[PDB]
Amino acid sequence: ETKGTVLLHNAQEMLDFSKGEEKQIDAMMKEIADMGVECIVAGAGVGELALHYLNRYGILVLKVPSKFELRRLCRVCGATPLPRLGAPTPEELGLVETVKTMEIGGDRVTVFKQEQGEISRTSTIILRGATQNNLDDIERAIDDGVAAVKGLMKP
Amino acid sequence: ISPPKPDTENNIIVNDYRQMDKILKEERAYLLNICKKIKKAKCNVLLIQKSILRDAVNDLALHFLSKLNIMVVKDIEREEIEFLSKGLGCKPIADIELFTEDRLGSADLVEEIDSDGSKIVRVTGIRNNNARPTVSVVIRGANNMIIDETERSLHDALCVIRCLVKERGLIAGGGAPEIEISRRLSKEARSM
Amino acid sequence: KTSRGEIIISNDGHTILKQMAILHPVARMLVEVSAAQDSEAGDGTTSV
Amino acid sequence: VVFMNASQERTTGRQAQISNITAAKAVADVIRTCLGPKAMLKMLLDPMGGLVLTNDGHAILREIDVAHPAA
Amino acid sequence: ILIVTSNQKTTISNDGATILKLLDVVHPAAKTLVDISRAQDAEVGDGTTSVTILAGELMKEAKPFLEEGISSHLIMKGYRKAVSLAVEKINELAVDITSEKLERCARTAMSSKLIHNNADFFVKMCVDAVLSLDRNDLDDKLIGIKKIPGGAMEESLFINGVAFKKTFSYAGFEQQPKKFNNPKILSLNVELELKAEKDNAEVRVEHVEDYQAIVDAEWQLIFEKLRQVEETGANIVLSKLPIGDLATQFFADRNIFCAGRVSADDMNRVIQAVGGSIQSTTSDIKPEHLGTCALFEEMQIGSERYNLFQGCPQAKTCTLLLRGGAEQVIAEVERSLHDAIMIV
Amino acid sequence: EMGRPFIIVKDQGNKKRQHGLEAKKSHILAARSVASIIKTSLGPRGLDKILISPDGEITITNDGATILSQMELDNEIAKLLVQLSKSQDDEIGDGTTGVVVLASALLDQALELIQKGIHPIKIANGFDEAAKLAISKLEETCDDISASNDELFRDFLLRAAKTSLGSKIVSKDHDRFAEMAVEAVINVMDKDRKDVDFDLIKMQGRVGGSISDSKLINGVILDKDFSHPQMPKCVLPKEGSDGVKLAILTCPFEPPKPKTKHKLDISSVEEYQKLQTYEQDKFKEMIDDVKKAGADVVICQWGFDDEANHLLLQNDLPAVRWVGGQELEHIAISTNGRIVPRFQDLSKDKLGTCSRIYEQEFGTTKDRMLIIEQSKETKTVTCFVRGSNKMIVDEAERALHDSLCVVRNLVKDSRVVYGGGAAEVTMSLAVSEEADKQRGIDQYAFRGFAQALDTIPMTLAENSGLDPIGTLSTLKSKQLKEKISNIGVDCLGYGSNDMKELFVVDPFIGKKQQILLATQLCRMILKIDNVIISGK
Amino acid sequence: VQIFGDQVTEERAENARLSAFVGAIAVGDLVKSTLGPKGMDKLLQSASSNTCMVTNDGATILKSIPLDNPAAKVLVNISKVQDDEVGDGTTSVTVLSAELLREAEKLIDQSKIHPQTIIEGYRLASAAALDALTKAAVDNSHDKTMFREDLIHIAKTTLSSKILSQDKDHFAELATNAILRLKGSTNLEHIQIIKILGGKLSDSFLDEGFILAKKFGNNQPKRIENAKILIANTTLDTDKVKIFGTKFKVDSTAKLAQLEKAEREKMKNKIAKISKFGINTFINRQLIYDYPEQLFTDLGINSIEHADFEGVERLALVTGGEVVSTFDEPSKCKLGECDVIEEIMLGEQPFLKFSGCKAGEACTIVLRGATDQTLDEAERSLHDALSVLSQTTKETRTVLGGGCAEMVMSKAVDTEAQNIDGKKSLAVEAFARALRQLPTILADNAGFDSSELVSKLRSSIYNGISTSGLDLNNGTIADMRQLGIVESYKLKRAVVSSASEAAEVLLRVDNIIRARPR
């Protein structure tokens, strides 16, 4: 966090500096691939050197900016985030049967949809419409129905 | 005269707290050894040209030359070094190792005259081997307009002697050459 | 009186012509005539 | 073109009915204190400078310039 | 319709979606025709003009109803009920047509727009364009088309792979052969040149003897990444990051083609064209990750040289090179081709 | 209006809308203003035009692509004709003035059909069908010259060269320009007479002297002189030699330093004294690697410090400084050398070979320029043009540039036609004959396309002071009596309207694009209805 | 329908052809009175700083005066090329190219001649004009005595049109010897021109040596005999080594004083290697500080600082030496030799004068003038004379001047006009009448007759005498071989070629388009 700088005293340390960083990500990403993790959710920008070994084992990469977007992802699969890059705990790993990418409104969207077993929470509703103005109030119209469900709990 | 400051950027790194004591002792020792070699040649007057980048004389070195009774003058124009070299017959000293007695000039009396709220340094007498002596004249006056014109009046006076020494011989002024040439030409103009 | 805060009182014709700007090109050459007399000789530059 | 030069924009519907009722009520609200034996007085300033001080209903209305047409 | 914006950008479009994008509509209700034009163009791509004409007519026929005593919701009851029976009527109009096995539908999509009279030619390329895309994928980038100003639109031809612009002139470019009999394309994210390596540059050297080894070490590390490419026999090297003249000249003596500055969207088409893979480091390069094709030839089109990828047995990339006199001519043709591919 | 402001689009009052017949009349008259400008410069009797730039620079040319490029316009229809000639110059490079006259001729005949009630699409549909009938007719009339050997093949290149050199300033030297333009392709070309590389020929202009001093020089012409000019200007090879062993280096002469920012800390006087010896050892090592390789002239991209001025002077090694990166590619091609990245990779096999390296004095002062010559046929040909005016040196570049565009098009196989208006007349009568067989609503469409092709021969008679009626009637009556298509308009008036005796030859690929660019552009213009132009 | 934007001026009609021809008339009439030895100088009023410039050369007059007419810019560019190529004849090209448009204006208006016909008429007319000068060219280079004498007569003709026509007899030898010193070198940057204000104009002299305006730094004597001159380009002041990544890591200032002292040891060791040559004088183009200058005092070596790089090449050719860096090897390095070196003073500024130098490949010219306007004119007057004589060493062919060369070319033009027939005969004969204007204007500036005097020169050539010419002093016909009026053959071809090509420019412009200024 303070004054990150490359220190090379002699040419001997410079020759092994290029191959040294490649072995660090390789050693860290190997423990994740050995656990059978086919998808990794990231909360910030991922360097290109880290994305290389993820494509070697066929591991998907997801970008989750800000906070609330990533917070509701773990409620679907039942996972516990951890800051370190080491091998995650098998008890903290989530379960998602299929991940699909198809064209809906002209752009590529990722499908987190769950199935009958291993049920998930915080489901989403795809809303299709011709005009964006109708899409705004129907979103608030659905929220009125969601708020009506809250009235079935406290009383 | 100052602590060492090479033109190339230098970095002084202090590893041990005891090194800070030796640094302050060597900085004054570097300026002391320079002043010790000046006293060996019995040089009581030092002239320093205008300084660029670091200062000409450090305040720490002022105490060295003051206790030894040595007059120090700095901020001298670089173009005036040629006049001071031939005028006083003193060979300039650009290195403390090349500083010697033979390169130093000589003067009978060196005194700074302070009068009417104005200070001026004058040298009385010159003793040396010189084939090109110099001269200096102090100009006074009421304001800068009169003083500048007093000097401009001297330029026209110094050029009169320059024309006589360069070209030997002179004529009579006051209207003599204007009427004489006009008369001698009028006689020849009728014959053409 | 110069355009700046400096003021010069001079009887020398060259100094007069130098500090006095002229808008006529041929009359500007009279300034250079006084410079030719002052550089080579230095006396009688107002007579030329 | 501009078509009609007089009020090409129009205020119709309930907006015109409210403006007629509200302005008509404001005419009666100022004279509410002018009714009864304890009624107060009202002073009027004309552009000529003559002062008229009375509790009479008509003398107050005719000397006041109302910009509202229906009022 | 000829429309010139405040930036003096000439655009000629009959499309209901493009016309409404040029003009800036500040009217709240008039912007609803813009949403339905962009929504129709996003999914199907055709009919954007017919939707706006039909939507505006429904409001025109409802104009005399509003002047009467008909309530606002009573009018919407008629449109919502009639559209329910109209969608079911379209299913009766349509036919399963599992018999007869793209040709007819691509000709009708070009109508009202340029090159429609040329449909005896451009339609043949529209058929094989989407057929290269496998089911459940149907990538919208792999059908990407490049526009070349100048020339005639009838001189266009079909290419089995992506063609990109060089955008930069290399000092060792001409020394590299432009004709390959059996090229091997290698996609790399590495940056080959003399520069600071990772995110920071500082060097501390006390002795002059060790100062010479620091310079020689920098040349060996850059050349080490260059030797690993030559040992694998890769004839073509593509990179997103810049490539200096040091790596370009090294590939010139080995008869290896070098390229850089290519956009991220173009190299995504390279992986699908030659069936290769992206390698972000030079130490992991393996022979089975290199793609190839039948031949590689660099042809100059309108004072612009492009790299031609063609002849691959299986390629999902389709890139067309369009020509035309006006800058809008090359835009209108792709605008017709982009809308015609979404129909098939 | 109902009393409230009605604004659909921002900047309502700023933008204007054109529709109806007034919108079509404004588009046709916009092309007529551009046509009448280009029609005056069409043909060898045409005249140039002055182009004043906003920065004060002037340009004198008859080229329709250059005139319209620097032309500041307003109407967008006239701006579409700018890229029309630009489309002709970028690809083919010939006939930029003919595509503007032919396109406006199609619009002039279309305006008469619009007033008769014909739908604009029906007009565009008739021009597309008539364009393919004219190309297929002229394709059958031309013959293949590829059967001739290389001796006669050079003659056909001289025929089409003299035609493109006309109509432009400094047309008196076209006899020598035609010879020098063909020899550039003779030296640089493929052995199969196909797909010649044009980028290997560079156009380098020089301002001074006279036009008679223009000659071909195979090699590299640089604006930089020899560094430290105490060395002889003209470099000569050794008695016996394989060549001059020209060296090319992209690395300046300096002691090795890391690309990254470095800090060299000297903690003692002994470490500082070693840097003094280490400094002079590198400048002595760099000059020895060139002497051991046998190289003579050294080329540096970034130059070198004054230390090596006398060092390379002792070994008699010429050197240049601050050579551009684009010029380094031009140097290695001429001498067939290889750029050496560093002294450790320097070898005798990577050195270039050229005949002689020398500089010319040119004028009085000016600047010093280096010239390289080749001893045999190479892949580099540099054009050398001189002139007494800055405008002459400029236009002569693009004048020979367009001449090279005609020769490289003849490299393509089996496409040749004869110019002088003979192509437009042959294709005009073929379209008018089909109009009688088709009839229908499109009968008037083929007539408008036939009358538009005759405008080019009639324009040639205007600049030559002839009668366009009597000239066109003679050409049409000749094609009906005999099948020879070689009769055309003569603006030089040497007689013999046969193009075979006058040697005038034009590329068919150039004439084919003139019809395609004119017909396909008018198809888009006739479709324009609403014209929305925002205020500047 | 207006396709052009706002504030766009264009003339598609007679107004364009009228503005193009009249635009060249004002340019030709401006430099018309400057042609000939009797011509008058022009005055230039600067828009800033109020700096007046008086020059007879037409190249400076056209470039200084702003001209917005494209027809005028064509005549300005050909004058800049004529100055940069040959170095003389900028006014003759502008006048001759303007007269070609004068004769072409009456053919289009009155005679109704096609513009290209006038252009094609000058093509066959210029071929006979260039061939007429070839047969009239005499090569005297076979004899060094006759070639050196011709260099004097050429200088008298060039210096006659300038203010030096009175003293040109004294300045003809100074310009001739300066070219002989170059030994065939066409580079004029090797000759230095020092302008001194005051004194007689005839006091200008040419010394054998190199006169340097710079002086010795401090203690070096003014006059010294038998001094070896050395030239060093690089550094030798507070040397930075090379790389910028060097620093001094110092634990205590006791070691820092030894590091800076090592920098002075590097300076002392480098000056000690200079003394191994045995030179009495050292010269550095880079300025020298006080510490390295004092090291030359005990060695008796002179020191010179702040020498310009363009003067280094001039200085190296005078001493015949070699620029020397990397002093480690004395063998491969060469030094210059000089008999005596004395510091003189011309005016207020003292100068460094050299005498008895081995090599003469470069020299220095000193000029004297009453005003700076005459000094700026004296330098430009010699710059035009030294440029022709420099090109004469390359191409030694010469052609007589004084109106002779212009009339001889017109003799061959009238012959070819008969065989052409057509309507080009009016265009070919117009080129011959345009050649009459150059000798005619020579008589107009001298107050002579423009008809009978020209007819006497024309009738004398058709009688079989090709040596006849015009004499402006006596106002009659005189022999050019006896008067010594001759010019270089390259100057004759340059004026005819540049004017013929420039005339073909404006005659091809039917339309003039002016974009909105920026």
Ligand SMILES: Nc1ncnc2c1ncn2[C@@H]1O[C@H](COP(=O)(O)OP(=O)(O)O)[C@@H](O)[C@H]1O
């Ligand atoms: N004592 C005198 N009596 C009469 N005339 C004099 C006397 N002194 C000088 N003059 C004349 O007056 C003139 C003064 O010129 P001056 O103003 O000195 O010129 P400048 O100032 O340019 O040197 C001289 O030319 C001289 O002839």
Ligand SMILES: Nc1ncnc2c1ncn2[C@@H]1O[C@H](COP(=O)(O)OP(=O)(O)O)[C@@H](O)[C@H]1O
């Ligand atoms: N010397 C000539 N003889 C006959 N016809 C010519 C001649 N020169 C040009 N032309 C004709 O004039 C037309 C225009 O040529 P030009 O204006 O020189 O170049 P561009 O074809 O680029 O406009 C050509 O189609 C050609 O047929």
Ligand SMILES: Nc1ncnc2c1ncn2[C@@H]1O[C@H](COP(=O)(O)OP(=O)(O)O)[C@@H](O)[C@H]1O
């Ligand atoms: N003594 C003389 N008698 C006759 N003619 C002369 C004499 N001196 C010069 N001339 C002529 O006057 C002309 C001067 O031309 P000049 O003004 O130098 O033209 P430019 O300025 O273009 O060089 C020369 O061409 C020369 O022939």
Ligand SMILES: [Mg+2]
């Ligand atoms: Mg459609």
Ligand SMILES: [Mg+2]
């Ligand atoms: Mg042409």
Ligand SMILES: [Mg+2]
């Ligand atoms: Mg002259």
